[PDB]
Scaffold this active site. Structure first.
Site, PDB file in Angstrom:
ATOM      1  N   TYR A 152       0.845  -1.190   0.000  1.00 29.25           N
ATOM      2  CA  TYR A 152       0.000   0.000   0.000  1.00 29.25           C
ATOM      3  C   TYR A 152       0.893   1.258   0.000  1.00 29.25           C
ATOM      4  O   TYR A 152       2.005   1.235   0.489  1.00 29.25           O
ATOM      5  CB  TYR A 152      -0.916   0.036   1.212  1.00 29.25           C
ATOM      6  CG  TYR A 152      -0.244  -0.218   2.538  1.00 29.25           C
ATOM      7  CD1 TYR A 152       0.012  -1.518   2.996  1.00 29.25           C
ATOM      8  CD2 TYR A 152       0.044   0.830   3.404  1.00 29.25           C
ATOM      9  CE1 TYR A 152       0.553  -1.706   4.255  1.00 29.25           C
ATOM     10  CE2 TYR A 152       0.558   0.604   4.658  1.00 29.25           C
ATOM     11  CZ  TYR A 152       0.832  -0.645   5.104  1.00 29.25           C
ATOM     12  OH  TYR A 152       1.425  -0.884   6.275  1.00 29.25           O
ATOM     13  N   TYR A 190       4.523   0.900   1.739  1.00 30.38           N
ATOM     14  CA  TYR A 190       4.615  -0.068   2.839  1.00 30.38           C
ATOM     15  C   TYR A 190       4.054  -1.439   2.379  1.00 30.38           C
ATOM     16  O   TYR A 190       3.350  -1.520   1.369  1.00 30.38           O
ATOM     17  CB  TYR A 190       3.823   0.328   4.089  1.00 30.38           C
ATOM     18  CG  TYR A 190       4.484   1.459   4.881  1.00 30.38           C
ATOM     19  CD1 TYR A 190       4.726   2.694   4.296  1.00 30.38           C
ATOM     20  CD2 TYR A 190       4.922   1.221   6.171  1.00 30.38           C
ATOM     21  CE1 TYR A 190       5.355   3.704   5.019  1.00 30.38           C
ATOM     22  CE2 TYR A 190       5.554   2.235   6.899  1.00 30.38           C
ATOM     23  CZ  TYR A 190       5.812   3.449   6.298  1.00 30.38           C
ATOM     24  OH  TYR A 190       6.416   4.487   7.048  1.00 30.38           O
ATOM     25  N   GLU A 214       6.426  -0.282  19.383  1.00 30.86           N
ATOM     26  CA  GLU A 214       7.758  -0.606  18.815  1.00 30.86           C
ATOM     27  C   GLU A 214       8.846  -0.405  19.834  1.00 30.86           C
ATOM     28  O   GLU A 214       8.788   0.513  20.654  1.00 30.86           O
ATOM     29  CB  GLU A 214       7.970   0.181  17.552  1.00 30.86           C
ATOM     30  CG  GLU A 214       6.895  -0.166  16.524  1.00 30.86           C
ATOM     31  CD  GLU A 214       7.219   0.331  15.133  1.00 30.86           C
ATOM     32  OE1 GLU A 214       8.252   0.944  14.951  1.00 30.86           O
ATOM     33  OE2 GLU A 214       6.487  -0.020  14.224  1.00 30.86           O
TER      34      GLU A 214
END
Lengths: 169, 169
Positions: free
Chosen positions: A20, A28, A73
């Site tokens: 996308y 990505y 993350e």
């Protein structure tokens, strides 16, 4: 911490593999490897080249067509993506610590072999203000790979066949 | 940074005022006061008592029934909420800095009267690890209040008429 994961609600989504492009042009790629895991690969933009396997995620159904994926993350980045399968659109909100905004190439690596390095950069800061990216994307390629296919995302974006990320359906 | 805000797409959502209870029992309340702002009010749970006006948000349409609200807080907390209007179902992901997890009462106030104090606690940390809350909620009460009603969320949860948060529709 994963009480929200309800596999009966996710049968239409688990196994999806999508490429996308956000409206800012950043390309990505995500693989929904199972009910609580994604692999992902960044092709272009601020953190192009970065790729991640075995990222633990919260995946929830918002409707028959729309699924959400959220995660934390080791860089300090927090993310929530939503995928509208019917409309072939994605939406991301990404809250990047300020250190990533200042030197994003620090995060460009196969992150799984650099987890102490990411946590070190994250501990040094700066943290604030977050660089907040809130952006729609067009899903250019979407396929069903099933669960637990270790081959979907297993190399750096530079090492894919010519034309891989440009394929559409 | 607010490129994704598209008022024309949000007319069915702006004005909504909802009371909801997450799967862990925590009872929340949100007013979508305009295309880029929410007020919210926390009735119970880890930060019961806390309320906030004029929180800048990213609101997007994911489908005709599903909207998403994402924001960065002066405490360092990041949030993304999705609402399925048709199903009266909400989902939230909240990424709390570690300092809130250690002493969550520090955030229990009318934040807008304590902005410097929140920035101070946020700057001292710790930040990591995030405490990540990812949960479905039942929307127990929903109504349309139109835009920029400054009365919907203007007092503490303890200063409301008896039964306010218990109302069902």
């Amino acid at each position: 911490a994963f009480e929200s994961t309800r596999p009966e609600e996710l049968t239409g989504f688990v196994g999806k593999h999508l490429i996308y492009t956000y409206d800012n042009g950043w390309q990505y790629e995500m693989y929904v490897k199972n009910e609580r895991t994604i692999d992902y690969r960044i092709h272009s933009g601020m953190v192009g080249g970065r790729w991640v396997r075995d990222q633990l995620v919260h995946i929830v159904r918002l409707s028959d067509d729309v699924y959400k994926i959220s995660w934390d993350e080791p860089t300090g980045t927090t993310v929530s993506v939503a995928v509208n399968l019917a409309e072939r659109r994605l939406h991301g909100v990404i809250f990047f610590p300020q250190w990533i905004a200042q030197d994003p190439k620090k995060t460009v690596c196969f992150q799984n072999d650099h987890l102490d390095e990411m946590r070190a950069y994250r501990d040094a800061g700066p943290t604030y203000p977050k660089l907040v990216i809130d952006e729609f994307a067009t899903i250019t390629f979407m396929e069903d790979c099933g669960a637990d296919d270790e081959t979907v995302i297993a190399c750096a974006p530079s090492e894919l066949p010519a034309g891989y990320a440009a394929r559409r359906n």
